[PDB]
PDB file of C-alpha atoms in Angstrom:
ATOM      1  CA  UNK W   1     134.080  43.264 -87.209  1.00 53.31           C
ATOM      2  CA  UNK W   2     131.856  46.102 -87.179  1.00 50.55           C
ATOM      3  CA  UNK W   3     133.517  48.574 -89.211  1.00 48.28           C
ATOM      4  CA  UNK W   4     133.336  46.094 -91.954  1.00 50.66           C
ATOM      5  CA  UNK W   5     129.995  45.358 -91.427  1.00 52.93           C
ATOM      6  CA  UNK W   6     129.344  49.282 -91.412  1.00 52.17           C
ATOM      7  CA  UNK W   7     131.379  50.318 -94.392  1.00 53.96           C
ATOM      8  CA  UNK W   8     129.344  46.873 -96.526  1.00 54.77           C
ATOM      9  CA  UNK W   9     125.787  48.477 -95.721  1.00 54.38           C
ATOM     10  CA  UNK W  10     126.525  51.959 -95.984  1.00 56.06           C
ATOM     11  CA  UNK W  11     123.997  54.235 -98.687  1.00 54.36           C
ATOM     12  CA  UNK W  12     127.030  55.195-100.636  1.00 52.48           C
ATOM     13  CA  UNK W  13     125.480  58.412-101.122  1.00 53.15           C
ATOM     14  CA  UNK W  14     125.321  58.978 -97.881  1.00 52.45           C
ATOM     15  CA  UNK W  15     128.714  57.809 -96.840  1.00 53.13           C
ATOM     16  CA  UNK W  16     129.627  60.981 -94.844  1.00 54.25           C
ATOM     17  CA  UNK W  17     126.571  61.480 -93.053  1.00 56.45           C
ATOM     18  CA  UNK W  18     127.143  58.006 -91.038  1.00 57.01           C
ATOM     19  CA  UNK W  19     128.914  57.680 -87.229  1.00 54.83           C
ATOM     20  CA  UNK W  20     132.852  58.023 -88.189  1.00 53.03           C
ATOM     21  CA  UNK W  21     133.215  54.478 -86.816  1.00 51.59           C
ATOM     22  CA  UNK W  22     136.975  54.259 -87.855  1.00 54.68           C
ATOM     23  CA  UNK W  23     137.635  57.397 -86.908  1.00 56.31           C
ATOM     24  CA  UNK W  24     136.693  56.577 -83.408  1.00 54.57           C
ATOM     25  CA  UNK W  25     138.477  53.481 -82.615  1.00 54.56           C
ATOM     26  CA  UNK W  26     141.688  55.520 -84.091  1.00 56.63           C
ATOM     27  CA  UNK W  27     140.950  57.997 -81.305  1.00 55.89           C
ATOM     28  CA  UNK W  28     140.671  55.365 -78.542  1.00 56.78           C
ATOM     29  CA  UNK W  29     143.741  53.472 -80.056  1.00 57.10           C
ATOM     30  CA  UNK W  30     145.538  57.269 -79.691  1.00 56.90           C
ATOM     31  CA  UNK W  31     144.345  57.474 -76.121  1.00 58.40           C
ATOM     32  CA  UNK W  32     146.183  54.588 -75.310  1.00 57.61           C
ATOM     33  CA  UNK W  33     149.161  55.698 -77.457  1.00 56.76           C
ATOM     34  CA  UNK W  34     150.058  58.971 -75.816  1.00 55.74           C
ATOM     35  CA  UNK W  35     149.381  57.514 -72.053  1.00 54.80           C
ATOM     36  CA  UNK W  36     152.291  57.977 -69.788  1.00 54.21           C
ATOM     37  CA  UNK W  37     152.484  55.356 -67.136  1.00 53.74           C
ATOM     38  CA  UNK W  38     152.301  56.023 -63.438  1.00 55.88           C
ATOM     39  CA  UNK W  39     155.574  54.533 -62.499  1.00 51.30           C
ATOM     40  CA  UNK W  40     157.538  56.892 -65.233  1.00 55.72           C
ATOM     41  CA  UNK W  41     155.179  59.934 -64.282  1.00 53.01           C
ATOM     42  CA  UNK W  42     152.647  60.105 -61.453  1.00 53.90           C
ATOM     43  CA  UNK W  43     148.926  59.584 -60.373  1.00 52.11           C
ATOM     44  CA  UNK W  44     147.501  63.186 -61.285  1.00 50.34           C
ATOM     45  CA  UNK W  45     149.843  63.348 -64.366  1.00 49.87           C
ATOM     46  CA  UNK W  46     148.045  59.998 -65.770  1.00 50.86           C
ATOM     47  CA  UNK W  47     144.111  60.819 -64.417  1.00 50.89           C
ATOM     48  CA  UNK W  48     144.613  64.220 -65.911  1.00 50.49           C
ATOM     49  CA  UNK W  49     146.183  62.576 -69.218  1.00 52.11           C
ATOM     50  CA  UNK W  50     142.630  61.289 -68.923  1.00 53.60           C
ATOM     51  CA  UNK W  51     140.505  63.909 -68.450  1.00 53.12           C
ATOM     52  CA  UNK W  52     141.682  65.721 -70.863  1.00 56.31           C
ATOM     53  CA  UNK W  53     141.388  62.703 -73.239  1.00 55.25           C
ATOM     54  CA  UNK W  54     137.639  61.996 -72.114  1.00 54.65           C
ATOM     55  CA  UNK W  55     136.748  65.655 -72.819  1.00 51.37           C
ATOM     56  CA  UNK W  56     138.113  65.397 -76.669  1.00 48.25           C
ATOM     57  CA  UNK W  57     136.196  62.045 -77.062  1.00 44.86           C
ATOM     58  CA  UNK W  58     132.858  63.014 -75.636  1.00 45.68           C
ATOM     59  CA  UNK W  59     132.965  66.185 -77.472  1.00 45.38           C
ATOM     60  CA  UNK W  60     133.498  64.142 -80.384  1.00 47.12           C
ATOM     61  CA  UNK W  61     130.679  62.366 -79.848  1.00 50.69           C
ATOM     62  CA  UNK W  62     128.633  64.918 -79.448  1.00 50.57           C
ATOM     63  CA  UNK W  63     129.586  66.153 -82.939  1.00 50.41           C
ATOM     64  CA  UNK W  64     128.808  63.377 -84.595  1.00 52.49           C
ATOM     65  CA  UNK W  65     125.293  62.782 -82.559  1.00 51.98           C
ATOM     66  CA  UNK W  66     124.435  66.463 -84.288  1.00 50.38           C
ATOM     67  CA  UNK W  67     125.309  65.191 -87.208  1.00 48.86           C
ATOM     68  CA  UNK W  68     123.286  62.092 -87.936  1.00 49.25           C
ATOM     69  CA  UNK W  69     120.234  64.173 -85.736  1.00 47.03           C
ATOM     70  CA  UNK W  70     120.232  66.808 -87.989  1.00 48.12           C
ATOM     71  CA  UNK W  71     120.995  64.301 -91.480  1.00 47.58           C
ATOM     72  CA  UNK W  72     118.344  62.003 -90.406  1.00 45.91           C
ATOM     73  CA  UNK W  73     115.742  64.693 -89.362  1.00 44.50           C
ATOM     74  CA  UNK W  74     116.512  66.123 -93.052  1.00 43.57           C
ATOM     75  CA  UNK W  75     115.633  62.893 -94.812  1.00 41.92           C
ATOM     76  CA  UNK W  76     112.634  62.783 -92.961  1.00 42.48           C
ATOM     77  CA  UNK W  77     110.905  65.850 -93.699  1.00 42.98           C
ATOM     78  CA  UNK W  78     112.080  65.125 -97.163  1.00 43.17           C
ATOM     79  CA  UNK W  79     110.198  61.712 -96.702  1.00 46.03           C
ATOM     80  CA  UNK W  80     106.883  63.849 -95.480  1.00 45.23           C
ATOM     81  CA  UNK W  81     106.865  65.718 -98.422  1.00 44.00           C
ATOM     82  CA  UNK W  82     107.370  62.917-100.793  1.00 43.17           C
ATOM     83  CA  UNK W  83     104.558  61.113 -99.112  1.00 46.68           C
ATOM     84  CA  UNK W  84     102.293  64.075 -99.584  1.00 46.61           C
ATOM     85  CA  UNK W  85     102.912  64.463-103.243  1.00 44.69           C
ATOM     86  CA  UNK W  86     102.918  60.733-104.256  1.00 43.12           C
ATOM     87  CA  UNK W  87      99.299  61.176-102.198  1.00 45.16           C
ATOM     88  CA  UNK W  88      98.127  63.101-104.559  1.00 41.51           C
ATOM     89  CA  UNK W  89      99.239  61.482-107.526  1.00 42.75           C
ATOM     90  CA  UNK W  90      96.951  58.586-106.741  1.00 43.92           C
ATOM     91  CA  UNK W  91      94.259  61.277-104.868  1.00 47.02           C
ATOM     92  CA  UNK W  92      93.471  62.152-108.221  1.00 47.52           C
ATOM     93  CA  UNK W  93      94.378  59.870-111.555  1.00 47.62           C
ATOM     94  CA  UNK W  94      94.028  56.775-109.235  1.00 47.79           C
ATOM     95  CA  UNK W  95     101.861  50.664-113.224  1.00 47.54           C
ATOM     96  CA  UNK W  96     104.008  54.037-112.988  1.00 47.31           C
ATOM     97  CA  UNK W  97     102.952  54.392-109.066  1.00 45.44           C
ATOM     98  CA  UNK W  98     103.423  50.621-108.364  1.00 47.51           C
ATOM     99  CA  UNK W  99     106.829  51.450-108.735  1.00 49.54           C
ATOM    100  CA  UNK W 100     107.103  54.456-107.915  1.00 48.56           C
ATOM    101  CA  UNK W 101     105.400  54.166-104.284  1.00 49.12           C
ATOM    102  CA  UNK W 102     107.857  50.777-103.989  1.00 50.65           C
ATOM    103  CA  UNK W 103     110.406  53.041-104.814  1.00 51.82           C
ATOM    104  CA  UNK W 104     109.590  55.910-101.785  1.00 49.74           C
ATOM    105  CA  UNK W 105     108.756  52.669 -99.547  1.00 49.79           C
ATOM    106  CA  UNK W 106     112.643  51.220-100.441  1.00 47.23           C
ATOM    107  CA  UNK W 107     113.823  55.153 -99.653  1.00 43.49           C
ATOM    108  CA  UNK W 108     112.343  54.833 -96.142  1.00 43.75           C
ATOM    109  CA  UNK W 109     114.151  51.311 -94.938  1.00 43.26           C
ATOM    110  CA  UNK W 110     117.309  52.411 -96.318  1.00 45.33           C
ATOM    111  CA  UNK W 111     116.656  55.281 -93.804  1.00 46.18           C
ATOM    112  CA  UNK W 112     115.621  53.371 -91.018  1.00 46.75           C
ATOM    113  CA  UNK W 113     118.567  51.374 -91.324  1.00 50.65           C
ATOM    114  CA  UNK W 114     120.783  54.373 -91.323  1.00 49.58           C
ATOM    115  CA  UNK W 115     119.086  54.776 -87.982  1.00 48.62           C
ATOM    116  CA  UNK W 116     119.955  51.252 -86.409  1.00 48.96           C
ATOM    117  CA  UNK W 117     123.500  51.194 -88.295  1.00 51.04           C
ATOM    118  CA  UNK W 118     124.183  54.397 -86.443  1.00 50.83           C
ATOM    119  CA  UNK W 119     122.759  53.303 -83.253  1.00 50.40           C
ATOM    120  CA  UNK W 120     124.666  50.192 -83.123  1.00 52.65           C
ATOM    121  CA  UNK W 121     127.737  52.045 -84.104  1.00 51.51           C
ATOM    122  CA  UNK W 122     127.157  54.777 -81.286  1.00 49.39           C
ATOM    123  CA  UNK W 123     126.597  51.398 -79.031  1.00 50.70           C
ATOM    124  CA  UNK W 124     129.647  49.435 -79.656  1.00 51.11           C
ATOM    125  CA  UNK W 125     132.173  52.383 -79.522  1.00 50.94           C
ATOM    126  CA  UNK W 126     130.826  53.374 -76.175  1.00 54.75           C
ATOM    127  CA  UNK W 127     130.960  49.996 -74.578  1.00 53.67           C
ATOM    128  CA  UNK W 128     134.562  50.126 -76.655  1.00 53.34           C
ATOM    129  CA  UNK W 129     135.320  53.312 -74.507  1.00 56.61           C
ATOM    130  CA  UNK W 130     134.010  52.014 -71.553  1.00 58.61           C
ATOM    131  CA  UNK W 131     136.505  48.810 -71.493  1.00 56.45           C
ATOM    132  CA  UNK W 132     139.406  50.347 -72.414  1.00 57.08           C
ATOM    133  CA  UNK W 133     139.014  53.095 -70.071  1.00 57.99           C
ATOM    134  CA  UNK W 134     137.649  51.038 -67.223  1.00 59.25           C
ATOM    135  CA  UNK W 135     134.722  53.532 -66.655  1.00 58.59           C
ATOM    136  CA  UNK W 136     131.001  53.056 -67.351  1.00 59.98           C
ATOM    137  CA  UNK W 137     131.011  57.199 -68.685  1.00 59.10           C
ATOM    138  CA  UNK W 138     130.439  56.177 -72.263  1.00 55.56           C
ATOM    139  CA  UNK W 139     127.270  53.723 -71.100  1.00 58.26           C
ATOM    140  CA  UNK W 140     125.883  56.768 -69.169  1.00 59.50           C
ATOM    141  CA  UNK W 141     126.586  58.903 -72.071  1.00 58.70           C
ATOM    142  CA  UNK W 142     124.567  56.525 -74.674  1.00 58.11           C
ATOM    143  CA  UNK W 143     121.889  56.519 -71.960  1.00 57.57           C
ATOM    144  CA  UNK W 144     121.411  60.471 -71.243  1.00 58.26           C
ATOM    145  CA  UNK W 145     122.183  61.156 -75.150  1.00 55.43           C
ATOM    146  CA  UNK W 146     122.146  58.670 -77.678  1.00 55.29           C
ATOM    147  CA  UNK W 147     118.877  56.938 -76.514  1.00 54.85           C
ATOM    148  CA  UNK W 148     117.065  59.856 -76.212  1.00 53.42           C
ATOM    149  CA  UNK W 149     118.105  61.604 -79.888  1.00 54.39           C
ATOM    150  CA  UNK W 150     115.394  61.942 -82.210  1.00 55.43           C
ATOM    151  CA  UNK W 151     117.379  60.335 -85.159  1.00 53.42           C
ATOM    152  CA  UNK W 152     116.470  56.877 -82.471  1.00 53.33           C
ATOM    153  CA  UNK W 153     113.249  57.954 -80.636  1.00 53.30           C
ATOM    154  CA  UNK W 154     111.555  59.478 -83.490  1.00 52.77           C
ATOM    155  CA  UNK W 155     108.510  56.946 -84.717  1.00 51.81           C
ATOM    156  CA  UNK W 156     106.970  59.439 -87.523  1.00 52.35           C
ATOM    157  CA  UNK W 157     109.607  57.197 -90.225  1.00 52.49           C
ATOM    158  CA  UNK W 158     107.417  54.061 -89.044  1.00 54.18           C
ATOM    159  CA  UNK W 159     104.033  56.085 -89.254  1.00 54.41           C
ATOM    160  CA  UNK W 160     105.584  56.698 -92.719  1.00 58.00           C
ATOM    161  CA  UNK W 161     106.287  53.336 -93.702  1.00 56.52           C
ATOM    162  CA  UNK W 162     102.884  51.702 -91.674  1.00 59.01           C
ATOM    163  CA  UNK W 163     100.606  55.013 -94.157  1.00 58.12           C
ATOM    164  CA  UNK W 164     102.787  53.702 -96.983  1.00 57.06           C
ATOM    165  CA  UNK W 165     101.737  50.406 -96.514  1.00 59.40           C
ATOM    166  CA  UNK W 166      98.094  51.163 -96.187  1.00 57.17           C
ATOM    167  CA  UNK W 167      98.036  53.003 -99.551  1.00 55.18           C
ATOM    168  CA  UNK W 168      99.894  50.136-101.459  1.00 57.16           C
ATOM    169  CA  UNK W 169      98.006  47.862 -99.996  1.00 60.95           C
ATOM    170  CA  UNK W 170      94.059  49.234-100.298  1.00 58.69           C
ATOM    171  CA  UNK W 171      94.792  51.305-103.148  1.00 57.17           C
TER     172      UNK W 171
END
């Protein structure tokens, strides 16, 4: 189960800053809660029932997409300017950096897997979606939005780690 999975190899410290996973499924579990059925009601009463519903989720997920986009765009400017000043460090005095580079290297994976954590997350709930409301919306929706965020296109974390790697290695 996934949101096991997610909640083991969640950064504690960044806990809030992942996809709300649980949150999600809760939503898609109310969809189905609140849906009146189309003998008891009618057909526009239960495709607007819906709408409406498919509206609140995608806005949701839009939300959340800004969220992890703007976290993960934080951490890596954060990451630049760590680079840049652990560049120095060695640019000039040439067992304390040994460390602390492995230290800034270990602070870039645990960011790149708060990429692919969120990813997958973003991936299952909108094939999730998709099933439950017999639709392919939510595919479309990862297609047109999710694969095309910079917290999941954005390659200057592996430039990062590939520099970091150079340094540690040469120097």
């Amino acid at each position: 189960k996934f949101a096991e999975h997610l909640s083991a190899h969640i950064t504690p410290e960044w806990r809030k800053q992942y996809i709300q996973y649980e949150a999600f499924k809760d939503m898609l579990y109310s969809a189905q809660d609140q849906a009146p059925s189309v003998e008891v009601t009618d057909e526009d009463t239960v495709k607007r029932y819906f709408a409406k519903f498919e509206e609140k989720f995608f806005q949701t997920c839009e939300k959340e997409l800004a969220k992890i986009n703007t976290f993960y765009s934080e951490k890596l400017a954060e990451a630049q300017r760590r680079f840049a000043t652990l560049q120095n460090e060695l640019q000039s005095s040439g067992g304390d950096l040994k460390l602390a580079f492995s230290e800034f290297y270990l602070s870039l994976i645990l960011l790149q897997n708060y990429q692919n954590l969120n990813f997958t997350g973003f991936r299952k709930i909108l094939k999730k979606h998709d099933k439950i409301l017999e639709t392919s919306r939510g595919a479309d929706w990862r297609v047109a939005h999710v694969e095309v965020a910079p917290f999941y296109t954005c390659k200057k974390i592996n430039q990062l780690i590939s520099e970091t790697e150079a340094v540690v290695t040469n120097e």
